[PDB]
């Protein structure tokens, strides 16, 4: 009577190689659940399936979450092997920070697509699967910028803010099906991702890379980063079935940058 | 006349021929702005542009917020009379319920692009003016559906949130440039919009429209319709100079169905 | 707004004698209400109401909010003179920040009586008369701190959410009696009281006062203080008949330093 | 969760022999928590006592969270047995509805000192053994009922609103002394009480109990009452190391009725 | 079954 894990689920993360991502995929892979990982370079995601084949049932699909043909085939395939997908995790994410007047329509369009078009088709492809089984959990790794404003990221808030929209939504379209839909909002973690956004901000404000990795700890409350296992807990929490009545909702986890209500 | 607060502002108002969009514009006449209409069917425009001439000066553009060489042309137009456009209100919606399952990629665009995209693309062209100006007003038209998750109208809600987004973060960019940047969020409103909607909803739920108008206006805890005047009014008083403290706000018309903080 | 708008109203402000309360008179009186202005100081009391008195009728009443045998006596007096009460103003407050272990009892309770309960009972006492005349607007000076969090201002952020969950429920208690309930949220304001803190700072840092105005105005967005008349501004545009649907919102002037939803 | 995660851990919760508190109480015992457990009964107090002794050392201490002397005795023959409480849970609170001009000032006052007065004391002489020992957990359990308004319920939610004012400024306060400071916010729950409520209003209208807990659970998309276990599982989540980075928060529990950001 | 959870 005391086993109550993930064993028999499938889940699938979107940009799991490195990350955010990989620590919700140790996490689900550690929980039993059978992972389908997905990233775009080769090398890194490999690593990260031989790693977690330790816990689970892991398998790796190179693929570009913006491309609706790759990810169609890439789902399919994935199924094939493991059965339909019971949980999503929609992780993949783009931002490029810049004063609003350099924002290009390329520049605007990269940052929808890969944000929240992106959720939308994969959610699209395997909601049925869900809804067949009776039981579900879609997270949408959205942001604090899904929750409030930051100047030079004008399209990064748009689209995490729209990610934020169709969790909402879809929490109540699909409340009495057995699913839930829930957003996890991180402030600034200690990521490959961050160090590229601070040495951008630093190029772009003339200052020091090591003052401007002081003024994004300075964001958060606690006086330090979040870290991707802080992220990943918050995953693995909403999974369990006494997080049925969790549903809608936007947890951030940024030590009190935004404290939502 | 003596309301003379905002004489001589070039406003445009997308979306102004109808609806929210004239009763905006009929506001922004009376307080003395001169009004650049937007919308696609010329008959209607026309109309409404012959009405609005007894206050101020006005003008008509024929064109689709969601096409951008079109929008481009109409912004080059619109200022030879005017000059450059000092409050602009973006005004022009897209809505379609379905369940989520029905939204095909086609149906998806329309939702993001009338509803955020051509938000970001006007606010684009008409900035680098505002800026020269040193004023501004930017007032984008969401919904409660920006705010909160309404079943079968997913898209619409991750759009409509996504102009929250774009609303929140542009406030904080231009806070130090003498502009504001808010959103107005009606909930169900007295419109032709409305009433294609309860039929619609109505002939998809086997149900009367009178039965689908009154669930409607159940939403709103006073028990019936906002009126559009009542949508206008909140964005009149955003143009003032004393609301130049209040940016980045969304402001939820809509008797107590969402209640902000 | 017009001179005319509001002709005929009462409205009762209290803490009216300096700062956002005496700018929030001014507005009304502008905007020809007729007034009754409560403070516990004479001289300063007597001195607003002859100021006022060039724009519409205006009467004051000594007293203090957390007294409610003098607050009783008080509200019948002004009745006698101008009749119900049809606008109410909680605009009286009190705040002094401390760290959280040396709040001893009576300190916690200042803050609740001052801001929350003294609201409640002013309220009960002309509720009454506004459900009489099928008409009337309660409007609740909250603060950007009934919204975030503040370190060292644990009971005034307690006492000020309070005042919200009051705004919000009475807001659909009353919905369709005609009557609307809602909360402005300043973020640090230009009064008198705040330059003598500053100067007084600037004196015993050896600092300009320029400077040390610098770090009262960082949070907001906007790089300065929010002036009185910012937040009068949206009092005002609340009592209008056309903001009837405004019902249950806090309103932040705060230039982008809170941002709700 | 493993049953080995919060051994060494006193915790102590509030109003823990029934419902939600008794629930979270059974969780943290099945974590590994030594447990103190407040109530004013005795013999539903000692029945719950003798139950959680099958996984952890668990007392019980009768009291009201509204007596400060009875809390002040409690509180120092608590520590003697399990010493320096590290996870406080405030769960003990008070509910009378009523229309809003039938409260008067002790029905106010009540729910204002049971449900914020109470967690305020608590948290002062807890806080010192939490700083200290550089290792905290402060849960509040708050309701939906503190981040939307209800009609009938103005005393109720301005206390529960309160209470998520004191959660957002002590978070911060606290934020870098090793302490999360966070609010559960439940909306209606499963308990004897509320069952024995649908039955009382079942027998009074001639219906189906069923037919009755429909209304009750009709505010919750998911239709049906959310479980104590599931707000439990939220608190002991919070618990958790991995948890540090939630801080400043309000998680509703409450199948999508308020949707938080 | 093999691994622990
Ligand atoms: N780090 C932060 O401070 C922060 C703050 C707020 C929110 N977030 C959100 O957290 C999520 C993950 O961010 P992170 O910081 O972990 O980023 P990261 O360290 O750069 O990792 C991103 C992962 O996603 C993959 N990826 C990137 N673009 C992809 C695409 N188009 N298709 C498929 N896989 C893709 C990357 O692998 P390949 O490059 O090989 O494809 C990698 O495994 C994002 O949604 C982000 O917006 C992060
Ligand atoms: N219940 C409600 O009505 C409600 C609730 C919440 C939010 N809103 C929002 O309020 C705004 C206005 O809605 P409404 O109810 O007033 O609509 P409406 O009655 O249908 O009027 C819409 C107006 O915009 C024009 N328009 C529509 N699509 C356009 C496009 N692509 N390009 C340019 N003009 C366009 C229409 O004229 P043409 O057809 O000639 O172009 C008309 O002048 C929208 O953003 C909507 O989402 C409405
Ligand atoms: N100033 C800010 O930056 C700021 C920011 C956020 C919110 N607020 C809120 O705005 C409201 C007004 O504050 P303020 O800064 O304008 O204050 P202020 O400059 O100190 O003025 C307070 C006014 O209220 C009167 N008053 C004070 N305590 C009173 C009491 N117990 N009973 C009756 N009258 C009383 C004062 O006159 P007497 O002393 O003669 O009674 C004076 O007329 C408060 O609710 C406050 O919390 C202010
Ligand atoms: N319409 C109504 O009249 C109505 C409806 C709902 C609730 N209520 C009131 O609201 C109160 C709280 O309701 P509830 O939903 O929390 O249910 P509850 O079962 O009364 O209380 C939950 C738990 O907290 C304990 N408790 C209650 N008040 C406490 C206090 N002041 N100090 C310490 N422990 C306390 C209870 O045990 P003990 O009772 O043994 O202390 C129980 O273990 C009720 O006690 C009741 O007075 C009234
Ligand atoms: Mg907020
Ligand atoms: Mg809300």
Not at 57 to 81: F, I, K, N
Not at 139 to 148: D, E, H
Request: net charge neutral; charged share 20%.
């Amino acid at each position: 009577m005391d086993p109550k894990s993930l064993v028999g689920k499938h889940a699938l993360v979107t940009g799991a190689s490195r990350g955010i991502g990989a620590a919700i995929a140790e996490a689900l892979a550690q929980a039993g659940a059978r992972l389908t990982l997905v990233a775009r370079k080769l090398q890194d995601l490999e690593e990260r399936v031989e790693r977690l084949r330790a816990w689970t049932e892991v398998q790796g699909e190179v693929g570009d979450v913006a491309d609706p043909q790759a990810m169609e085939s890439l789902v399919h395939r994935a199924q094939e092997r493991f059965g339909p997908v019971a949980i999503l995790v929609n992780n993949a994410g783009f931002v490029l920070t810049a004063p609003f007047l350099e924002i290009n329509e390329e520049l605007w369009q990269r940052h929808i697509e890969v944000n929240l078009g992106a959720a939308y088709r994969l959610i699209r492809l395997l909601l049925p699967g869900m809804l067949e089984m009776g039981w579900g959990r879609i997270i949408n790794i959205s942001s604090t910028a899904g929750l409030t404003g930051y100047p030079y990221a004008v399209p990064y808030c748009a689209a995490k803010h729209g990610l934020i929209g169709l969790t909402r939504a879809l929490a109540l379209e699909l409340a009495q099906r057995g699913i839930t839909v829930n957003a996890i909002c991180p402030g600034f973690t200690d990521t490959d991702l961050l160090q590229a956004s601070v040495l951008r901000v630093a190029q772009r404000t003339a200052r020091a890379p090591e003052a401007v990795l002081e003024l994004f700890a300075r964001r958060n409350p606690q006086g330090r980063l979040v870290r991707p296992e802080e992220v990943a807990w918050a995953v693995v929490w909403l999974c369990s079935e006494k997080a049925a009545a969790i549903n809608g909702q936007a947890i951030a986890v940024a030590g009190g940058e935004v404290m939502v209500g």
